[PDB]
Design an enzyme around this catalytic site. Structure first.
Site, mmCIF file in Angstrom:
data_model
loop_
_atom_site.group_PDB
_atom_site.id
_atom_site.type_symbol
_atom_site.label_atom_id
_atom_site.label_comp_id
_atom_site.label_asym_id
_atom_site.label_seq_id
_atom_site.Cartn_x
_atom_site.Cartn_y
_atom_site.Cartn_z
ATOM 1 N N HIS A 117 45.876 47.321 39.713
ATOM 2 C CA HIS A 117 45.272 46.314 38.812
ATOM 3 C C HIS A 117 43.766 46.518 38.535
ATOM 4 C CE1 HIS A 117 43.558 43.455 41.959
ATOM 5 N NE2 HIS A 117 42.740 43.216 40.936
ATOM 6 N N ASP A 149 51.057 46.923 43.871
ATOM 7 C CA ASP A 149 49.675 46.989 43.443
ATOM 8 C C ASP A 149 48.988 47.989 44.330
ATOM 9 O OD1 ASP A 149 47.460 46.415 42.021
ATOM 10 O OD2 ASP A 149 46.987 44.534 42.960
ATOM 11 N N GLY A 152 36.511 40.673 43.019
ATOM 12 C CA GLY A 152 35.657 41.817 43.321
ATOM 13 C C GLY A 152 36.040 42.471 44.637
ATOM 14 N N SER A 155 39.070 43.275 45.393
ATOM 15 C CA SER A 155 40.395 43.927 45.199
ATOM 16 C C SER A 155 40.275 45.404 45.438
ATOM 17 C CB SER A 155 40.923 43.655 43.798
ATOM 18 O OG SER A 155 41.248 42.273 43.684
#
Length: 246
Positions: free
Chosen positions: A46, A97, A196, A198
């Site tokens: 993502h 993800d 932020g 991630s």
């Protein structure tokens, strides 16, 4: 990172800081990641799905600060950006993800270990700590949900693993959370990952070994009651990692 504390790269030497160059030449922060071998950084898909072109990205290793350089840092380009083909999103709850970035310096080299740059072990397959175990998360994400800015100094905190039966309750995430995800939160909901963070590491100690258990992926808000942070469960993707790094 909501709550927790400030830290430096020595305390998380595998943390990678991923930026993207824009047309016009501006460089902005994207997400964290984790160095799993000299040439390979692991992160979330993502972070990249909207700008899937490898050339746009810069990866730093050994860096403790967001907009200033840390002594001994290494800067890389992305030789390959590997997104998971089964990725899917909504409304927050991203599936598969996970992403691999193969790094190469201008001089054609990968990571050189140092006091500030080391690798992190993957878990063994289907092997995770029991629920309630305390683990750490690291990143440059927001300090409070309402903030506009991101902290200049890297941060870490501690969160506890939550069971899939607890996470799948309707009052938590219902069916948004799958067996390939992990939930983790603070008992008082006072600390958490946020926007932020991630792509970065959830690191747990299993059998004496610091282990990359999870990769920050999604959540509804941050440090919200009944709303844990959600992490890609690394121990369910070893075959994908191995093939993709070979």
């Amino acid at each position: 990172i909501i709550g927790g504390e400030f830290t430096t790269i020595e305390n998380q030497p595998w943390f990678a800081a991923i930026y993207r160059r824009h047309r016009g030449g501006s460089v902005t922060y994207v997400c964290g990641g984790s160095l799993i071998s000299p040439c390979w950084v692991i992160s979330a898909t993502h972070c990249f799905i909207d700008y899937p072109k490898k050339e746009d990205y810069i990866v730093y290793l050994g860096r403790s600060r967001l907009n200033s350089n840390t002594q001994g840092e290494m800067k890389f380009e992305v030789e390959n950006l590997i997104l998971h083909k089964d990725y899917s999103a909504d409304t927050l709850a991203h599936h598969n993800d996970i992403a691999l970035l193969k790094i190469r310096s201008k001089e054609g080299r990968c990571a050189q270990p140092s006091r500030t740059i080391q690798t992190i072990a993957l878990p063994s397959m289907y092997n995770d700590p029991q629920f309630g175990t305390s683990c750490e998360i690291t990143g440059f994400g927001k300090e409070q949900s309402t903030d506009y800015l991101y902290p200049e100094q890297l941060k870490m905190t501690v969160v506890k693993l939550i069971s899939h039966r607890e996470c799948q309750q309707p009052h938590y995430y219902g069916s948004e959370v799958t067996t390939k995800m992990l939930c983790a939160a603070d008992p008082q909901w006072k600390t958490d990952s946020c926007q932020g963070d991630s792509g970065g590491p959830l690191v747990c100690s299993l059998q004496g070994r610091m282990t990359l258990t999870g990769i920050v992926s999604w959540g509804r808000g941050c440090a919200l009651k009944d709303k844990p942070g959600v992490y890609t469960r690394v121990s369910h993707f070893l075959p994908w990692i191995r093939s993709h790094t070979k």
